[PDB]
């Protein structure tokens, strides 16, 4: 059973500043056979379903802005936004697709400090 | 706690024929306030992370082929592929994003009968 835990639960930074959200999996999601991390990051904008941002722990999905980047390996991971944009207000989720059933973290609410 | 159950676990149809996969949530994922179903369908092609196909139970994501369509409401849902294409070989997952932590079904493997 893999449980995903995020930290913090919510945070706020001024526009243009960096934001950092962490995620921890109960078990390792690094597959030894291919040395890849089965971890993903989702962005859930207000009233919208979560959409894929990063997969394989650090591979950015197409169309996704350059300011988003994932890092980490094993059990500790980090989603970083280099420079916060207004449209980034959302709840960010981390997911392990290492073993079924695929599980999500409980989300970290990102807001901008006005 | 919401558990997603899929049926069958794997199936195969000849190219060009219809394929049907079912999903059932342990609790209702229909939100009374807006009358929307917080259900999604993901396609996981061989060695790739699951990608979003359908959300809001029947809304197709952009770029997704017209042959894919989701239906159902409440607890019973269905993913239908009108005419099976060769590139559709994959494991299909249904997800509830009604309540955290968002959960996935265990997947239904789709293959083509040669
Ligand atoms: Zn600051
Ligand atoms: Zn047939």
XYZ file of C-alpha atoms and ligand atoms in Angstrom:
230
model
C 0.000 0.000 0.000
C 1.596 3.286 -0.994
C 0.593 6.497 0.777
C 1.622 9.919 -0.532
C 2.177 12.784 1.916
C 2.604 16.420 0.901
C 4.077 19.411 2.717
C 3.012 22.058 3.386
C -0.782 21.921 3.026
C -0.936 25.458 1.645
C 1.526 28.275 1.010
C 1.691 31.710 -0.568
C 4.456 33.689 -2.240
C 4.489 37.008 -4.079
C 4.169 36.982 -7.871
C 7.460 36.189 -9.552
C 8.968 34.448 -6.543
C 9.765 30.754 -6.176
C 7.383 28.232 -4.620
C 8.354 24.795 -3.335
C 6.070 21.871 -2.490
C 7.276 18.517 -1.163
C 5.936 14.979 -1.470
C 6.902 11.735 0.253
C 5.828 8.212 -0.685
C 5.411 5.522 1.997
C 7.552 3.112 -0.066
C 10.143 3.709 -2.778
C 8.769 4.426 -6.239
C 12.158 4.025 -7.924
C 12.182 0.938 -10.139
C 15.636 -0.684 -10.034
C 15.216 -2.385 -13.427
C 15.077 0.922 -15.327
C 16.187 3.448 -12.694
C 13.040 5.550 -13.159
C 10.769 7.121 -10.543
C 7.076 6.423 -11.020
C 6.020 9.798 -9.609
C 3.805 12.459 -11.147
C 2.680 15.991 -10.291
C -0.823 17.309 -11.037
C -2.213 20.843 -11.051
C -5.852 21.315 -10.077
C -7.008 24.820 -10.951
C -10.194 26.113 -9.201
C -13.131 23.966 -10.300
C -11.124 21.975 -12.831
C -9.938 18.367 -12.738
C -6.264 17.801 -11.882
C -4.112 17.930 -15.045
C -0.678 16.346 -15.525
C 2.352 18.584 -15.027
C 5.399 16.366 -14.469
C 5.984 12.610 -14.846
C 9.006 10.312 -14.266
C 9.703 12.667 -11.350
C 11.250 15.345 -13.580
C 9.923 15.075 -17.146
C 7.682 18.008 -18.013
C 4.496 17.211 -19.928
C 4.001 19.008 -23.273
C 2.409 22.452 -23.180
C 3.434 22.856 -19.524
C 5.272 26.145 -18.732
C 9.037 26.078 -18.195
C 8.708 27.419 -14.640
C 7.507 24.013 -13.428
C 10.105 21.345 -12.598
C 10.050 18.194 -10.491
C 12.984 16.629 -8.634
C 13.856 13.948 -6.108
C 14.288 10.193 -6.182
C 13.152 7.211 -4.157
C 10.694 8.485 -1.550
C 11.346 12.256 -1.314
C 10.238 14.531 -4.153
C 9.878 18.259 -4.825
C 7.823 20.396 -7.209
C 9.339 23.803 -7.814
C 7.897 26.849 -9.543
C 10.799 29.162 -10.421
C 8.699 32.322 -10.722
C 5.068 32.359 -9.558
C 2.482 33.425 -12.145
C -1.074 34.549 -11.355
C -2.678 31.566 -13.117
C -0.752 29.149 -10.880
C -3.299 29.432 -8.069
C -4.350 25.804 -7.618
C -4.029 22.673 -5.492
C -0.979 20.603 -6.485
C -0.984 16.823 -6.125
C 1.762 14.225 -6.330
C 0.928 10.696 -7.475
C 2.671 7.348 -7.416
C 1.917 5.127 -10.371
C 4.453 2.576 -9.190
C 1.905 0.065 -7.943
C -1.861 -0.270 -8.186
C -3.998 1.186 -7.056
C -2.263 4.448 -8.016
C -2.550 6.892 -5.120
C -2.496 10.659 -4.699
C -1.203 12.914 -1.966
C -3.837 15.085 -0.272
C -2.876 18.265 -2.114
C -1.060 21.500 -1.387
C -2.960 24.720 -2.013
C -0.909 27.397 -3.731
C -1.973 31.038 -3.561
C -0.290 34.346 -4.287
C 0.479 36.804 -1.494
C -1.033 40.108 -2.650
C -12.719 6.173 1.581
C -13.531 5.696 -2.085
C -12.529 2.480 -3.850
C -12.702 2.127 -7.634
C -13.408 -1.281 -9.179
C -13.044 -2.079 -12.875
C -14.460 -4.867 -15.028
C -13.215 -6.868 -16.770
C -9.508 -7.042 -15.892
C -8.511 -7.560 -19.523
C -10.310 -7.998 -22.836
C -9.587 -8.250 -26.541
C -11.547 -7.345 -29.655
C -10.651 -7.334 -33.343
C -9.431 -4.084 -34.902
C -12.298 -1.770 -35.745
C -14.725 -3.324 -33.286
C -16.116 -1.760 -30.118
C -14.575 -2.248 -26.677
C -16.317 -1.577 -23.372
C -14.755 -1.243 -19.918
C -16.722 -0.613 -16.724
C -15.877 1.149 -13.471
C -17.692 1.348 -10.141
C -16.949 3.689 -7.240
C -17.589 2.591 -3.635
C -19.495 5.842 -2.968
C -21.239 8.283 -5.298
C -18.979 10.738 -7.101
C -21.881 12.882 -8.310
C -21.819 16.280 -6.611
C -25.394 17.468 -5.995
C -24.419 21.158 -5.904
C -23.345 21.203 -9.567
C -24.678 17.876 -10.870
C -21.240 16.816 -12.134
C -19.465 13.468 -11.801
C -15.909 13.678 -10.513
C -14.745 10.688 -12.564
C -11.862 10.425 -15.006
C -10.474 7.831 -17.419
C -6.742 7.337 -18.041
C -4.890 5.457 -20.771
C -1.566 3.858 -19.875
C 0.265 2.771 -23.013
C 3.087 0.173 -22.599
C 5.858 1.723 -20.510
C 4.253 5.161 -20.377
C 2.568 6.978 -17.498
C -1.245 7.041 -17.522
C -2.527 10.033 -19.537
C -5.936 11.706 -19.204
C -8.638 10.646 -21.657
C -12.019 11.667 -20.229
C -13.036 13.874 -17.282
C -16.410 14.911 -15.768
C -17.440 11.361 -16.701
C -17.996 12.237 -20.369
C -15.900 15.261 -21.375
C -13.113 14.283 -23.753
C -9.710 15.859 -23.130
C -8.165 17.825 -26.031
C -6.159 15.867 -28.588
C -7.967 12.656 -27.587
C -9.443 10.665 -30.533
C -13.194 10.780 -31.149
C -13.542 7.012 -30.677
C -13.180 7.416 -26.906
C -16.261 8.351 -24.860
C -17.176 8.024 -21.195
C -20.667 7.592 -19.737
C -22.505 6.812 -16.520
C -23.448 8.735 -13.405
C -23.282 8.241 -9.662
C -21.368 5.016 -9.031
C -21.502 3.103 -12.351
C -19.422 4.313 -15.296
C -18.370 3.061 -18.732
C -15.512 3.804 -21.129
C -16.324 2.920 -24.711
C -14.079 2.751 -27.757
C -16.314 2.829 -30.846
C -13.767 1.273 -33.208
C -10.559 -0.281 -31.853
C -7.298 1.073 -33.282
C -3.913 -0.666 -33.052
C -2.384 2.052 -30.851
C -5.124 1.551 -28.244
C -3.318 -1.390 -26.644
C -2.947 -0.200 -23.050
C -4.225 -0.496 -19.485
C -7.212 1.797 -18.864
C -7.845 3.292 -15.432
C -10.808 5.111 -13.935
C -10.246 7.669 -11.177
C -12.419 9.472 -8.673
C -11.305 12.983 -7.860
C -14.395 13.550 -5.747
C -12.618 13.299 -2.411
C -8.995 13.121 -1.317
C -7.005 11.135 -1.567
C -7.963 10.660 -5.232
C -8.031 6.941 -6.012
C -7.637 4.784 -9.103
C -9.209 1.526 -10.173
C -6.775 -1.363 -10.676
C -6.789 -1.147 -14.469
C -8.236 -3.060 -17.391
C -5.794 -4.333 -19.995
C -6.956 -3.827 -23.561
C -5.446 -5.870 -26.383
C -6.403 -6.578 -29.972
C -7.458 -10.060 -31.066
C -5.247 -10.859 -34.067
Zn 8.436 36.390 -0.612
Zn -15.366 -9.467 -32.244
